Amino acid sequence: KPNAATRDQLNIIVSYPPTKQLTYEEQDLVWKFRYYLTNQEKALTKFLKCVNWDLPQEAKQALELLGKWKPMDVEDSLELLSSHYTNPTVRRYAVARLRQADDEDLLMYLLQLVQALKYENFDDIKNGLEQDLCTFLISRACKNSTLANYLYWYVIVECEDQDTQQRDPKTHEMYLNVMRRFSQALLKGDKSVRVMRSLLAAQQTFVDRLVHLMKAVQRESGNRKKKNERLQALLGDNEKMNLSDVELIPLPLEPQVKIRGIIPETATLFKSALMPAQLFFKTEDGGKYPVIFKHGDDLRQDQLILQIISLMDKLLRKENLDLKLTPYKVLATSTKHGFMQFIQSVPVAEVLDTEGSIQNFFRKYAPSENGPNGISAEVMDTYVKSCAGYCVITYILGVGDRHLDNLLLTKTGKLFHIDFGYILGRDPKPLPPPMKLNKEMVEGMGGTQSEQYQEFRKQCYTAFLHLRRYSNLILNLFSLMVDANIPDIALEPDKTVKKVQDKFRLDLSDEEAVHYMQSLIDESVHALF
């Protein structure tokens, strides 16, 4: 029906990022050829964006075409749950597509889907005390204990958000109703589901006791040594505090791991202003699981970034690219406390203080006579890959405040980033560079003169092209976060998705994007020396 020139225009429009606004002329064109476009699943979101949903006759025809359209890919349906859509049939269609996702994929989107409840019908959620989003999420949680664990903690954090309670009371009451609905469904279910309900309650009381313990340690006004002694003494009094030995419960941070308590003798406070605790949990497997427990601290921005880093890692692995990344787990248990999975590591700043160079560090703990610069080839391969992964990922996410205390290294060669208080282009100092590499980091692989430097560049190109291909998904997930209580998002909600979108350079072809990434890396490295 449309000629070659029109098809080229339509294909450009269909390729747009999910939050790019269509012009009036593009809306006219998509509508004109709506019947031709029903055979392209990628065109459906563009068509739905061109409908005037406030005109009953047009909404009706649009819903007729929706039923005849080649169904969109499951992950594309996240766009239909954003704030743009109030039409109930559109939003139920999105849930119907999401019902086809497996539990592993749904978990990767769950943080954002909980935010998307803000765009649902609050009366329907309350009156539940065909599937809408609330009903769907609860239904899937009732069948999967991992989903139930994260749904519980994600929602309870929303219930405790005093900002929401003060500034958006109806939204706060909705989340209360979601929790009530969730508890309703769990109690109504069979034995395995009612057991799940009791285990969530047990986790909550454990966290409550841990919070009370942290406060007791901080009413102390002794030095750090005295506070470590207080922390260990309180943890050791199980009759008083009940944290050294408890009946088995899922670890909120990673519920597949059941824990029996916390080891009292090895608990210490970090030497930092907020004095978070390092705690070793006794696992059911008879092992130990170290965490950081932060108290008096909002972990939600870190929680989001580590969730997105975990997604990006899984997407790269899906494309058979394992860049040896460290997406450590982060879970907020309230707006003021939460857990982080502790990875044995050393900050690069400490490596330079004690060994002088990343290379000296690798030569000490991973020597190899015939290896690159006397270092194990496997360790160097792991180093190059992880540098590349984090270079591309922190560039896309605009991570700031990149000093050598936030760059961590393992003896197996993994480099990874921590502490994501500055994202989306924010930085303590002005005019941060678009790509934040460290001189010590290039030096760690042998300098620009090493063959490792070209291996690093090559892995950046590959990772960048792979993540570009999932830009629709990544951008849709940020679009669902724009109203969230996340500091660097709430600063400029209407600009948030574009800040990520621009990093993908979707205006460039693959070959042009590789050229651009090459120039960006080289320019950043050149500026360092």
Ligand X SMILES: C[C@@H]1COCCN1c1cc2n(n1)[C@@H]1CCC[C@@H]1NC2=O
- Site size toward ligand X (CB under 6 A) is 13
> Is position 343 an interface residue for ligand X (rule: CB under 6 A)?
yes
Question: Quick check: 121 binds Na ion (CB under 5 A)?
Answer: no
Spatial neighbors of 211 by CB under 8 A, at least 6 apart, are 295, 334, 337
CA atoms within 13 A on the CB side of 468: 21
Q: Which residues pair with 278 in a beta bridge?
A: 268, 292
Listed by the residue before each break, gaps in the chain with C–N over 2.5 Å are 129
Q: What gap in Å lies between CA 220 and CA 212, rounded to an integer?
A: 13
Q: Is 292 in the site for Na ion (CB under 5 A)?
A: no
Among 34, 118, 140, 295, binds Na ion (CB under 5 A): 295
Q: Is 403 in the site for ligand X (CB under 6 A)?
A: no
Among 164, 345, 479, 524, binds ligand X (CB under 6 A): 345
325 scored as a contact of ligand X (CB under 6 A): no
Look at residue 418 and give the partner it binds from Na ion, ligand X, none, a contact being a CB closer than 5 to 8 Å depending on partner kind.
Answer: ligand X
The residue written with tokens 């998002």 in the block is 489
Per CB under 5 A, does 310 bind Na ion?
A: no
- By beta-carbon proximity to ligand X, the closer residue of 277 and 525 is 277
Q: Would you say 268 or 283 has its CB closer to ligand X?
A: 268
Nearer of residues 408 and 520 to ligand X, judged by Cβ? 408
342 binds, among ligand X, Na ion, none (CB under 5 to 8 A by kind): ligand X
Least distance (Å) between residue 410 CB and Na ion:
10
Q: Which stretch binds ligand X (CB under 6 A): 200-208, 338-346, 369-377, 389-397?
A: 338-346
242: left (phi over 0), alpha (psi -120 to 50) or beta: left
Report the C-alpha gap between 320 and 17 in whole angstroms: 25
List strand residue ranges (DSSP E) for 386-497, in order.
407-409, 415-417
Report how far residue 477's alpha carbon sits from residue 489's, in angstroms, rounded to the nearest whole number: 13
Distances (CA, A) of 197 to 106, 189, 202, 242, 259: 20, 10, 9, 21, 17
From 10-18, 295-303, 466-474, 506-514, span contacting Na ion (CB under 5 A): 295-303
Restricted to residues 269-308, the positions that interact with ligand X (CB under 6 A) are: 270, 272, 276, 292, 302
DSSP run (H or E) holding 281: strand 277-283
- Told to check if 326 binds Na ion by CB under 5 A, we report yes
In the complex, the smallest distance separating the C-beta of residue 407 from Na ion, rounded to whole angstroms, is: 16
The helix (run of H) or strand (run of E) holding residue 207 is helix 191-219
Burial class for 3, CB neighbours closer than 10 Å (0-12, 13-18, 19+): exposed
Query: Measured between alpha carbons, how far is 453 from 445 in angstroms, rounded to an integer?
Result: 7
Give yes or no for a contact between 403 and 349, defined as CB atoms under 8 angstroms apart.
yes
Of 441, 474, 471, the residue nearest 456 (C-alpha): 441
Of the candidates 328, 395, 478, 504, which one interacts with ligand X according to CB under 6 A? 328
Cβ neighbours around 287 below 10 Å, total: 10
Span 212-231, contacts to Na ion by CB under 5 A: 214, 218
Q: What is the closest distance, in whole angstroms, from the C-beta atom of residue 343 to Na ion in the complex?
A: 6
Out of 6, 40, 183, 278, the residue judged to bind Na ion by CB under 5 A = 278
CB of 334 to ligand X, least distance (A): 17
Stretch that binds ligand X, among 158-166, 337-345, 383-391, 512-520 (CB under 6 A): 337-345
Q: How far is the CB of 421 from ligand X (least distance, A)?
A: 8
Instruction: Show the tokens assigned to 197.
Output: 């309900």
Residue 346 binds to ligand X (criterion: CB under 6 A): no
CB of 270 to ligand X, least distance (A): 4
Binding residues for ligand X, rule: CB under 6 A, are 270, 272, 276, 292, 302, 328, 340, 342-343, 345, 408, 418-419
